[PDB]
Amino acid sequence: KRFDLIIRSSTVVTETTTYRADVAIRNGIVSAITEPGSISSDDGPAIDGTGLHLFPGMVDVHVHFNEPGRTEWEGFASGSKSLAAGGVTTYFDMPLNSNPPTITREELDKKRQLANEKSLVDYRFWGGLVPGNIDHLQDLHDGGVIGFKAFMSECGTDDFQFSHDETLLKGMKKIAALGSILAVHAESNEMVNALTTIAIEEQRLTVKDYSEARPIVSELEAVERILRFAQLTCCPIHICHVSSRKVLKRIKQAKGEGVNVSVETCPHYLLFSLDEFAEIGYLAKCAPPLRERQEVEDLWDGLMAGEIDLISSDHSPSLPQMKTGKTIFEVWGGIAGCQNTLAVMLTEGYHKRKMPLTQIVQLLSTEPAKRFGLYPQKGTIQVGAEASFTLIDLNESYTLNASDLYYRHPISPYVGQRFRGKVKHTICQGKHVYQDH
């Protein structure tokens, strides 16, 4: 026992390269990387990783585990259980649906302790920016939040209020002075509910109608607005779940001009179109809505061309009764998918569309860690860095069924999907945290 654990016989895949090696863990950090078989068989406990690929532990910057207050939607226990099954070793819990929201330093501390008790993998926390809490932002940053999250349009439960233009500007001035970053749900509030009201009036209750009631142009307006505020405030900004390449091109234009902006998408915008929205029905309702097939196809072209900074789940679960309603406008929208993010990426990106695995690491691990100041500690397989990684058999086929899910409620639009590439092991900070079977 010279080392606490050793991964044997794998291919290490990184954000830039692949190579065969043994990786030796000591006190939760990587101690030694060696040529295959170089370390004595009597020098520590070993995971047999022959025929498997070792990715760095995925960093998911967008989850809603909803504990406390709406703990019965997910919880820190089942939430972090799901992530380990999907190869995720670090997650950033969003400040909302959690009730009260993570609005103050006190409300953070209560969430912090429930994560310290129930979470299987490592955690960080989003602070909340709402109309009231401009004095609380300083305190939240001292509480150690990785960033802040405001909403540009009304969403879900109305105890987390969306920010009007005055709130956004005052918060950003403070957040920039804090040396932090603000994430936004960029939809255009008044375009959204004006078009929704029209759609409910006219009995147009299809999946396409929902998509057009919160259209791409609405995403473009809110993105354009927030970029301009960012330019004034010099506040680093992150744009959550973009559905369309049209929006990515506008962010590219801003990046070229000098704006400190990142942009994410989510794997359901990569997997499902309006056709799949129709057939799955209510489980595939999200904000922003799913778009047409042409639009999904163009979004992959954006990803391939480096127009997306990172991928995150936007794991947004609810009580199974909330997913049933009158029509598409009645259903509480959001996708339960954080266990399957790596799976769809590997399946549709690597096997189907021939994206390199190096870019899967970059998008789901490395850039999430860089953008929030956790690099090279996280997002890497290197000497000195945190020993958080995941072993994947890249060629293992499986139909996902509800029995596989570790979500508090096993219901998903990904149920009945055929994947290829299965996580077999997940190691978080030295601790053997998940094994298949």
- Binding site for Zn(2+): what residues are annotated? 62, 64, 149, 185, 241, 314
Question: Looking at 109, 165, 330, 436, which residue binds its own copies (CB under 8 A)?
Answer: 165
Which one, 11 or 133, has the nearer CB to its own copies? Answer: 133
Is residue 166 near its own copies by the rule CB under 8 A?
Answer: yes
- For residue 26, the partner it binds in its own copies, Zn ion, none, with Cβ less than 5 to 8 A by kind, is none
Is residue 132 near its own copies by the rule CB under 8 A?
Answer: no
- For residue 57, the partner it binds in its own copies, Zn ion, none, with Cβ less than 5 to 8 A by kind, is none
Least Å from the CB of residue 168 to its own copies: 8
Least Å from the CB of residue 332 to its own copies: 24
* Chain residues in the site for Zn ion (CB under 5 A): 314
Least Å from the CB of residue 343 to Zn ion: 20
Which one, 221 or 367, has the nearer CB to its own copies? Answer: 221
Site size toward its own copies (CB under 8 A) is 22
Least Å from the CB of residue 14 to Zn ion: 29
Least Å from the CB of residue 287 to its own copies: 18
Query: In three state form, how does the secondary structure of the chain look?
Result: CCCCEEEEEEEEECCCCEEEEEEEEECCEEEEEECCCCCCCCCCCEEECCCCEEEECEEEEEECCCCCCCHHHCCHHHHHHHHHHCCEEEEEECCCCCCCCCCCHHHHHHHHHHHHHHCCCEEEEEEECCCCCCCCHHHHHHCCCCEEEEECCCCCCCCCCCCCHHHHHHHHHHHHHCCCCEEEECCCHHHHHHHHHHHHHCCCCCHHHHHHHCCHHHHHHHHHHHHHHHHHHCCCEEECCCCCHHHHHHHHHHHHHCCCEEEEECHHHHHCCHHHHHHHHHHHCCCCCCCCHHHHHHHHHHHHCCCCCEECCCECCCCCCCCCCCCCCCCCCCECCCCCHHHHHHHHHHHHCCCCHHHHHHHHHHHHHHHCCCCCCCCCCCCCCECCEEEEEEEEEEECCHHHCCCCCCCCCCCCCEEEEEEEEEEECCEEEEECC
Q: Which stretch binds its own copies (CB under 8 A): 9-17, 79-87, 227-235, 411-419?
A: 227-235
Is residue 231 near its own copies by the rule CB under 8 A?
Answer: yes
Is residue 224 near its own copies by the rule CB under 8 A?
Answer: yes
Which one, 204 or 225, has the nearer CB to its own copies? Answer: 225
CB 271 within 8 A of CB 241: no
CB 420 within 8 A of CB 405: no
- For residue 383, the partner it binds in its own copies, Zn ion, none, with Cβ less than 5 to 8 A by kind, is none
Binders in 34-93 for its own copies, by CB under 8 A: none
Is residue 260 near its own copies by the rule CB under 8 A?
Answer: no
Question: Looking at 40, 106, 144, 228, which residue binds its own copies (CB under 8 A)?
Answer: 228
Which one, 287 or 360, has the nearer CB to Zn ion? Answer: 287
Least Å from the CB of residue 224 to its own copies: 5
Is residue 204 near its own copies by the rule CB under 8 A?
Answer: no
Question: Looking at 49, 215, 236, 337, which residue binds its own copies (CB under 8 A)?
Answer: 215
- Please name the residue that has the structure tokens 């109305």: 158
Cα torsion 242, 243, 246, 249: sign: positive
Is residue 169 near its own copies by the rule CB under 8 A?
Answer: yes
Is residue 209 near its own copies by the rule CB under 8 A?
Answer: no
Is residue 191 near its own copies by the rule CB under 8 A?
Answer: yes
- Please name the residue that has the structure tokens 């598409």: 328
| Measured distance CA(295)–CA(270) in Å, rounded | 10
Instruction: Annotate each residue in 285-324 with x if it binds its own copies (CB under 8 A) or - if it does not, as one string.
Output: ----------------------------------------
Which one, 315 or 378, has the nearer CB to Zn ion? Answer: 315
Q: Which stretch binds its own copies (CB under 8 A): 18-26, 104-112, 161-169, 285-293?
A: 161-169
- For residue 221, the partner it binds in Zn ion, its own copies, none, with Cβ less than 5 to 8 A by kind, is its own copies
* Dihedral angle computed from the Cα positions of residues 192, 226, 95 and 170, in that order, rounded to the nearest 10 degrees: -120
Is residue 170 near its own copies by the rule CB under 8 A?
Answer: yes
Q: Is the peptide bond preceding residue 376 cis, with omega within 30 degrees of 0?
A: yes
* H helix and E strand count, the chain: 14, 16
The footprint of its own copies (CB under 8 A) covers: 164-166, 169-170, 188-191, 194-195, 215, 217-218, 220-221, 224-225, 228-229, 231-232
